[PDB]
Coordinates of C-alpha atoms in Angstrom, one line a residue:
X200 CA 11.8 29.1 -1.9
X201 CA 9.0 29.7 -3.9
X202 CA 8.0 25.9 -4.2
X203 CA 7.7 25.7 -0.6
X204 CA 5.9 28.8 0.2
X205 CA 3.3 27.3 -2.1
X206 CA 2.8 23.5 -0.9
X207 CA 2.8 25.4 2.7
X208 CA -0.8 26.9 1.5
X209 CA -1.6 23.4 0.0
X210 CA -1.4 22.2 3.9
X211 CA -4.4 24.1 4.6
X212 CA -5.8 24.1 1.3
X213 CA -6.3 20.3 0.7
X214 CA -9.3 20.4 -1.5
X215 CA -7.2 22.3 -4.0
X216 CA -9.9 25.4 -4.1
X217 CA -7.7 27.8 -4.4
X218 CA -9.0 29.7 -1.2
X219 CA -7.7 30.0 2.2
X220 CA -9.6 32.2 5.0
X221 CA -7.2 35.0 6.8
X222 CA -7.2 32.8 9.9
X223 CA -5.3 30.2 7.7
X224 CA -3.0 32.9 6.0
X225 CA -1.5 34.0 9.6
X226 CA -1.1 30.1 10.5
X227 CA 0.6 29.4 7.5
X228 CA 2.8 33.3 8.0
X229 CA 3.7 32.1 11.7
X230 CA 4.8 29.0 10.6
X231 CA 7.5 30.3 7.9
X232 CA 9.8 33.1 7.4
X233 CA 9.9 34.2 11.6
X234 CA 11.2 37.6 10.1
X235 CA 8.0 39.2 11.5
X236 CA 6.7 39.3 14.9
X237 CA 3.0 38.6 15.2
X238 CA 1.9 42.1 16.0
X239 CA 2.9 42.6 12.6
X240 CA 1.7 40.3 11.1
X241 CA -1.4 40.8 12.4
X242 CA -1.4 44.5 11.6
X243 CA -0.7 43.8 8.0
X244 CA -3.5 41.0 7.9
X245 CA -5.9 43.8 8.1
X246 CA -5.4 44.7 4.5
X247 CA -5.2 40.8 3.5
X248 CA -8.7 40.0 5.6
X249 CA -11.6 38.1 3.8
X250 CA -13.5 39.4 1.2
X251 CA -17.5 39.7 1.0
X252 CA -17.8 36.2 0.2
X253 CA -15.3 35.0 3.2
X254 CA -12.3 33.9 0.9
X255 CA -8.5 34.8 0.4
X256 CA -7.1 33.5 -2.8
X257 CA -3.3 32.3 -1.9
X258 CA -1.9 31.9 -5.2
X259 CA -1.4 36.1 -5.8
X260 CA 0.1 35.8 -1.9
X261 CA 2.5 33.6 -3.1
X262 CA 4.0 36.7 -5.0
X263 CA 3.9 38.8 -2.2
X264 CA 5.4 36.5 0.3
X265 CA 8.5 35.8 -1.9
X266 CA 9.2 39.5 -2.5
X267 CA 12.2 40.6 -1.3

């Protein structure tokens, strides 16, 4: 199950730069593991917003996505 969520990010990070935007993070999150509602995804995405550089590293998010 960890492999699935890593490749899911590469669908958007085609360049393989290791970064996606917060708008792409929700795109992945709504496409897989539907255990959360959109409202629940949107309230937590406020902690997972973009940095001042405008990027979010999804590799650390892989670890959080496979959490229990």
